[PDB]
Scaffold this active site. Sequence first.
Site, mmCIF file in Angstrom:
data_model
loop_
_atom_site.group_PDB
_atom_site.id
_atom_site.type_symbol
_atom_site.label_atom_id
_atom_site.label_comp_id
_atom_site.label_asym_id
_atom_site.label_seq_id
_atom_site.Cartn_x
_atom_site.Cartn_y
_atom_site.Cartn_z
ATOM 1 N N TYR A 38 -6.494 -0.174 9.950
ATOM 2 C CA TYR A 38 -6.695 -0.135 8.338
ATOM 3 C C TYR A 38 -7.331 1.251 8.348
ATOM 4 O O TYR A 38 -7.788 2.101 9.411
ATOM 5 C CB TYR A 38 -7.614 -1.126 8.097
ATOM 6 C CG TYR A 38 -6.772 -2.424 7.491
ATOM 7 C CD1 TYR A 38 -5.911 -2.136 6.489
ATOM 8 C CD2 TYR A 38 -7.044 -3.679 7.819
ATOM 9 C CE1 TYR A 38 -5.221 -3.108 6.091
ATOM 10 C CE2 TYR A 38 -6.275 -4.601 7.477
ATOM 11 C CZ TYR A 38 -5.382 -4.370 6.456
ATOM 12 O OH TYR A 38 -4.620 -5.382 6.030
ATOM 13 N N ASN A 95 -13.867 6.482 3.472
ATOM 14 C CA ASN A 95 -14.028 5.537 4.416
ATOM 15 C C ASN A 95 -12.956 5.836 5.610
ATOM 16 O O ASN A 95 -13.453 5.573 6.884
ATOM 17 C CB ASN A 95 -13.771 4.187 4.117
ATOM 18 C CG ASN A 95 -15.055 3.652 3.105
ATOM 19 O OD1 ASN A 95 -16.093 4.324 3.336
ATOM 20 N ND2 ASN A 95 -14.707 3.114 1.930
ATOM 21 N N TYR A 133 0.794 -1.197 -0.111
ATOM 22 C CA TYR A 133 -0.008 0.050 0.123
ATOM 23 C C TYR A 133 0.824 1.133 -0.077
ATOM 24 O O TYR A 133 0.436 2.602 -0.146
ATOM 25 C CB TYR A 133 -0.842 -0.046 1.169
ATOM 26 C CG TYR A 133 -2.010 -1.231 1.234
ATOM 27 C CD1 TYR A 133 -2.973 -0.990 0.423
ATOM 28 C CD2 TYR A 133 -1.588 -2.112 1.947
ATOM 29 C CE1 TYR A 133 -4.028 -2.146 0.585
ATOM 30 C CE2 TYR A 133 -2.577 -3.387 1.973
ATOM 31 C CZ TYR A 133 -3.710 -3.075 1.332
ATOM 32 O OH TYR A 133 -4.767 -4.151 1.500
ATOM 33 N N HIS A 137 -3.921 6.196 -2.348
ATOM 34 C CA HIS A 137 -4.711 6.293 -1.066
ATOM 35 C C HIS A 137 -3.776 6.805 -0.051
ATOM 36 O O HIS A 137 -4.265 7.281 1.264
ATOM 37 C CB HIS A 137 -5.174 4.807 -0.720
ATOM 38 C CG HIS A 137 -6.513 4.686 -0.149
ATOM 39 N ND1 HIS A 137 -7.418 5.641 -0.655
ATOM 40 C CD2 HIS A 137 -7.315 4.052 0.582
ATOM 41 C CE1 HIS A 137 -8.441 5.427 -0.052
ATOM 42 N NE2 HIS A 137 -8.582 4.485 0.682
ATOM 43 N N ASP A 192 -6.372 11.821 0.606
ATOM 44 C CA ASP A 192 -6.646 12.036 -1.062
ATOM 45 C C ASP A 192 -7.748 12.573 -1.370
ATOM 46 O O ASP A 192 -8.789 12.136 -0.784
ATOM 47 C CB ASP A 192 -6.223 10.641 -1.251
ATOM 48 C CG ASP A 192 -6.988 9.572 -0.758
ATOM 49 O OD1 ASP A 192 -7.418 8.607 -1.287
ATOM 50 O OD2 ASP A 192 -7.139 9.552 0.737
ATOM 51 N N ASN A 237 -10.135 2.109 7.266
ATOM 52 C CA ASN A 237 -11.557 2.037 7.813
ATOM 53 C C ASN A 237 -11.729 1.979 9.416
ATOM 54 O O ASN A 237 -12.966 2.114 9.895
ATOM 55 C CB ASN A 237 -12.340 1.049 7.153
ATOM 56 C CG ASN A 237 -12.113 -0.299 7.361
ATOM 57 O OD1 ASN A 237 -12.589 -0.853 8.091
ATOM 58 N ND2 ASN A 237 -11.152 -0.771 6.606
HETATM 59 O O1 LIG Z 1 -13.220 5.625 0.481
HETATM 60 C C1 LIG Z 1 -12.125 5.649 0.185
HETATM 61 O O2 LIG Z 1 -10.985 4.920 0.640
HETATM 62 C C2 LIG Z 1 -11.524 6.321 -1.107
HETATM 63 C C3 LIG Z 1 -11.510 7.607 -1.494
HETATM 64 C C4 LIG Z 1 -10.397 8.510 -2.212
HETATM 65 C C5 LIG Z 1 -11.096 9.652 -2.139
HETATM 66 C C6 LIG Z 1 -11.499 10.824 -1.274
HETATM 67 C C7 LIG Z 1 -12.672 11.445 -1.252
HETATM 68 O O3 LIG Z 1 -13.913 11.038 -1.963
HETATM 69 O O4 LIG Z 1 -12.554 12.532 -0.163
#
Ligand SMILES: O=C(O)CCCCCC(=O)O
Length: 194
Positions: free
Chosen positions: A68, A116, A17, A22, A95, A70
């Site tokens: 993680y 997330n 990763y 991300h 991001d 999330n």
């Molecule tokens: O949910 C995610 O992990 C990914 C999104 C990258 C997006 C950034 C955003 O829509 O603020």
Amino acid sequence: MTAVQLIVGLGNPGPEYDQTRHNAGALFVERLAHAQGVSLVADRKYFGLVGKFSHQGKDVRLLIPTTYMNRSGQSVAALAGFFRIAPDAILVAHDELDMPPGVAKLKTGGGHGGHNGLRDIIAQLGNQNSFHRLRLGIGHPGHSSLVSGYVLGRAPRSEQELLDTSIDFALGVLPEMLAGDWTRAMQKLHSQKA
Ligand SMILES: O=C(O)CCCCCC(=O)O
């Protein structure tokens, strides 16, 4: 009026990763920590890597969660909780799909925009979305079904360079960010073209 006490850079842990799209937030903090000569200490108590430096008599902390993406809130809530930090003294770099590479902006409160990591943070804080956000542009793949794989991939050389330019523009307005003066911080940032 409200000093920034905690800077958070979101990302996913592990080699598979690293350097991915991300992990832009984490990269920013990683670069911010190196500019300041701050050490990221692995602390199981807060589920991530923690860093600390003083600025105007107060302790400013840096955090990269190692749970993680999330379950990030857990880590954020763990640190804010122990040190009694108000949500509005927190800046989370991440991001942003909605802006292209080479572009960075600031925002106070709002939705998680499907992100997330942001979403677990609002939850774990007790529905507090009142915190601050450095949104580092990574671009959109073009369609909604392609998003999961786009953020989990490494970008072409030309794109990373633009992101690198934008993280540099961002550190350029750090003096204004640590102080909490967001309107000027925005006025100086929002007018830099890659
Ligand atoms: O949910 C995610 O992990 C990914 C999104 C990258 C997006 C950034 C955003 O829509 O603020």
